[PDB]
Subunit: 367 residues, 4 copies
């Protein structure tokens, strides 16, 4: 399937080989996608359109920590392990991205998974699992216990490097972004800092924004697209014909950055979001987490910092910052393009942004 | 049973009638205490010494929010719903305080409880439950699933006003503080802010500190007490004769404070902690959350702020601040006194601070 | 001359009557602009291209505080009075925006001005002046004491409502933005929340960004413009032909917001900046301060909060948030268009963004 | 003259050789003390009781940065350069501690001093001087321009290693703490972190707290001391018999800590303050700044991090934290003992805590 670039959307900078967070060596991603039932929602019975996405910063077999820092755009949402990140500049274990209703289940399941994987002497380090959410309430039975521990184990165990599936998968399965179908998106940038190159990888779970604000490559596009407004049981549910017939951003880099420097990286995410036109809804939980895969902390050991960067080194830091902004901008658009039309709970129907129209618009704007 | 004052420990200020967080009208507290098994710990088979403590800011039937603000002393621990508090200055639902291994279970159980209590239209407001932890790893099978959804429901439903049980109860059941038995403690102050008297109530779940640092009423008491060091299988496990035969602070007030003013309140907890001598362990998750029961936010309506206070009004603010410092100091000592000797997982034995010795020391120091 | 809209740049939303921060009633703005000398720079002798911009939140005769909250995009710069804003949610006195070299002089001058204007009994409230900077180092003798106490008095005393001068004036006089001439810009939005209208006004002092990242109305315009690169003594200083022949954002609103709510407003500034393409340089001090003119604190008195807004009231908050994003986006373009080509210290020459070319590009893009 | 230990006050831990911040190698301290005039205050004509204290983290000839992090206890005061510290984890140049009315003068004077001392290529790094304040309003003509640029230069140039003068000197000259004479205090700890011993040094400028709250070595001493309350014109101005005849903490360490780790150190200061009984007044600007003298950043070069420490290494981190708490606690008492009775502006008279009574009390409590 085409990604944003394939439909003629231009972006600045140089993407990595996979144009994904896994361009950062050693990062693994797994999805479990839960899609079952149709028709009217009954709490505890579905329909279910949900799941979980796992990111292993250093792979599923690592017991070590990664240096980390976060940023909050708008904090109406949950992301666990973040007080830890704020205090000691690192976290242990995987990142889980999921639906709001799944947070506690995922949190405990990650603990159960550790008991079966980790040496008992190291169990203390698995007590603060990192779990984050956006709300799949239009398409999913949020409270209905559709996600199981087995689902979580499968994502943890199945995670891998290489190409990352985008769209209606894992934590993104039941999401809605810019009044089009939401979900998972990813992008990367290879950046030049003097004689050195670094990779900045971004993955998003997008459930934010309004169609009328959306910009793609600077084009305010919602009004250029015809139709494709959401429907409920046959009736247009938004837009001019209404009535008629949160955002999680994960940044990986192999740059050997210190925790406070990774906070700076995280704070660049908002600028990439800003490029695409949204204004951070009052109830939209929008968060960024950044980590380094080269600045690593062996469990109970000496931190490994292979090289060290000056915060005032504009050449290096700006290269890295611009990388975050650009990869974030593109990951957001890649999400929209990868997500297909879906019908879910209560016959709610949300359209993937139409490929034919997007390509036509891009061709006209960028001949 | 005697509380700290009853053993001759002096404190400054005037406590409320109950000398507890429930001196703040409408606050309800519940505990479920889980104690089963003895001897060698096998993960999933106990022994269990754990539980959960519930605090309903406005009572169990409230759908409304309370103005709130938080502070971090040392952030190596979990407390959910805090991004929400940082962002919008309020939280919905109960505060749960529990052991580290129970966070996910408690988080989902609270959602489940809401489904059976609140109108479907208010379910959105129940998606970010507030759950905090300290670690009962010495006395409890942390990973062993000792806490059940029923335990959580019982605490949610059984919560009430009036006297608050202290010691080895609810979330505090298997905790250890200042190398003595840890647990739950509570105290309050009624403070004169001009011609208006507010109540400041504090509850702690204590699992922090070293005996060598402990100060009670300014007395460095660890070396004055003889014996009572922890044991394993009858062998002293800490202190000089070793070998021979986190902190959660919840502040309630009826002062009509704005969210940023409640952050100031929460930041006062550290001074109260400082009075008692600990230095915040590198891995001690020490947190404070402050809320108002008068500044309330009707769900989906207009915030109710019955009066308004100027931050530069020293008379009012300092009365409130001093209240927090004093009530926190006393709550910590009250905890120690209420907690009794316990033997738990792996035959670990932790002594309650000896009442006879404490009373003897206080009598000598304060005739 | 022309402002951005006059050159055919489209923006979203409805500007206030003045399309300026002074659309918020009672706000006063004053500039002192210092331009003297030409040729090679000698420290302490000029050339000078600097100044100061004063914003009185409630007018120059007010002794009262305004509710306030801030946000940091990248904190490599100075802005005094901000610890106060963080702590007590308000500040007293005017905001001064100036060149880095002028900070201390302006800070003390504001105290001096207070001694002469304020009742003796109220002098305590004047001890924490609000002063912020960006660096005019290419065009100005930064260290050379070009700004005087008299210059500051003149801006304090000459401040007024009505139209605000933009471009090479006040604190913006010697600034550079997006490799074109920087300086002062302003814009406003009147926003609708049901039957209620509010105004959000923004003023920027812009000294940030690179030409190659600049977006105006979503158009990446740096490569579309021919020439107009900076020069030093007749030699192109940047861009392809090189070698051959920080950001301060002030947000005012009449919305009756609490301090933590104004922090949310301030955090929206970054999204507006993001729209225009910059990525926050490592050494670019980018800050936002937001205040309410309706939520005011009589000195030594009871805060006046005429109405109260729920943070979860999306209709109201989103209206205000969108206002910040749009007004920030426009104030940045308004700055560029207002700023004229300038030659300063060491014969550095920076071009105002070319009006003829910009208009042509906008016409071609937006027929 | 005796310090606190010499009067019989016990403290925990091992001080460095000097028991002062200069036990951390390379740190230099300088004071300029300004004392002139008696009787009634007229703004601009004294009497003056003020000054400035300079701390050079790496000595007066250093152009390099030190890694640093800060904490706020209560933010109603000024400390410049802190946005920089928050963002990039270091600051350049000296720390100045002074009276509130002197901030702007000191800020500009430090720039002027740099112009004379620093190479031209390094001037950019001198643009964000670090200046902090407490308010000497009872004893000093705050607005009266008593401090001159020459005073600042003398303290910058006269700074040295070795014993540090305490009491009514430099920035502390006109201060008041716990209703006794305030001033400068300092202490250090050498702390055992495994097989390595680090030094933690602390200097305070104390202008905070109330006599009734003061604890010295856990003894609530205000009521044990007879007389010595402040007077105006021979009449008691505070306390029971009235009418009858802010805090700055600077932490230095040679531990090679990263910036986020120094924030942790700074957050420990509050516990040390807590030990001595104060509750952080609403208008008391109470701040801490911590820097490392081993983790240094050559100007425009590669950061030098000689060794690296794990945040979860309890043995090392707790040793450092305990050092901060104990050194802060002792610095505060050392201040009181060093500070002598002073009469200043408006015939305000503030007593040094009486040495004879203190020694007698300590002897009775600690036989
Ligand atoms: N991040 C998920 C969306 C969400 C879910 C709940 C809220 S609350 O303020 O009503 F608790 C806010 C935002
Ligand atoms: N045999 C003991 C296994 C075990 C069980 C629990 C832990 S904890 O510190 O993470 F709670 C550590 C080790
Ligand atoms: N608050 C519970 C104790 C705790 C549990 C785990 C950690 S971690 O750094 O190893 F993730 C830290 C502190
Ligand atoms: N209308 C059916 C009940 C219901 C209502 C709201 C939700 S929520 O996902 O937005 F919290 C879930 C289920
Ligand atoms: N905000 C003005 C620009 C500026 C000026 C100086 C610095 S410093 O890191 O060298 F202290 C950083 C940024
Ligand atoms: N009546 C004396 C005038 C005066 C002089 C100084 C102050 S201060 O607290 O701001 F330093 C206050 C009042
Ligand atoms: N840190 C100095 C004391 C101080 C504290 C507060 C202020 S004010 O801005 O709230 F009036 C002024 C001076
Ligand atoms: N290289 C010439 C001297 C000089 C260099 C830099 C500056 S500054 O404004 O960036 F601090 C000022 C003067």
């Amino acid at each position: 399937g085409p990604r944003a670039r394939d439909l003629g959307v231009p972006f600045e900078g140089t993407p990595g080989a996979l144009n994904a967070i896994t361009d950062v060596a050693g990062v693994e991603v797994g999805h479990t996608t839960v899609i079952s039932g149709d028709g009217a929602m009954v709490i505890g019975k579905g329909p279910y359109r949900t799941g979980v996405t796992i990111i292993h910063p250093l792979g599923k077999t690592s017991l070590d920590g990664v240096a980390a820092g976060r940023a909050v755009i708008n904090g109406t949402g949950e992301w666990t392990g973040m007080h830890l990140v704020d205090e000691v500049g690192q976290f242990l274990g995987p990142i889980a991205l999921t639906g709001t209703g799944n947070v506690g289940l995922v949190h405990q399941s990650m603990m159960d998974w550790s008991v079966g994987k980790v040496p008992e002497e190291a169990l203390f380090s698995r007590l603060l699992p990192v779990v984050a959410e956006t709300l799949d309430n239009r398409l999913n039975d949020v409270f209905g216990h559709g996600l199981t521990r087995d689902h979580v184990f499968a994502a943890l165990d199945g995670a891998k490097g290489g190409p990352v599936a985008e769209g209606n998968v894992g934590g993104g399965t039941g999401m809605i972004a810019y009044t089009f179908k939401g979900g998972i998106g990813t992008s990367s940038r290879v950046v030049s800092a003097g004689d050195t190159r670094y990779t900045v990888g971004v993955l998003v779970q997008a459930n934010h924004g309004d169609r009328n604000d959306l910009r793609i490559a600077g084009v305010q596009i919602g009004k250029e697209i015809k139709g494709a407004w959401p429907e409920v049981n046959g009736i247009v549910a938004a837009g001019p014909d209404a009535g008629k017939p949160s955002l999680l951003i994960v940044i990986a880099t192999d740059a050997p950055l210190m925790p406070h420097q990774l906070e700076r990286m995280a704070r660049r995410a908002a600028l990439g979001v800003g490029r695409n036109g949204s204004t951070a809804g009052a109830l939209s939980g929008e968060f960024a987490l950044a980590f380094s895969t080269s600045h690593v902390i062996p469990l109970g050991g000496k931190p490994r910092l292979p090289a060290i960067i000056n915060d005032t080194d504009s050449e290096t830091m700006n290269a890295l910052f611009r990388g975050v902004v650009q990869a974030t901008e593109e990951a957001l658009v890649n999400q929209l393009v990868a997500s297909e039309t879906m019908t879910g709970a209560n016959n709610a129907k949300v359209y993937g942004i139409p490929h034919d129209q997007l390509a036509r618009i891009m061709k006209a704007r960028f001949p």
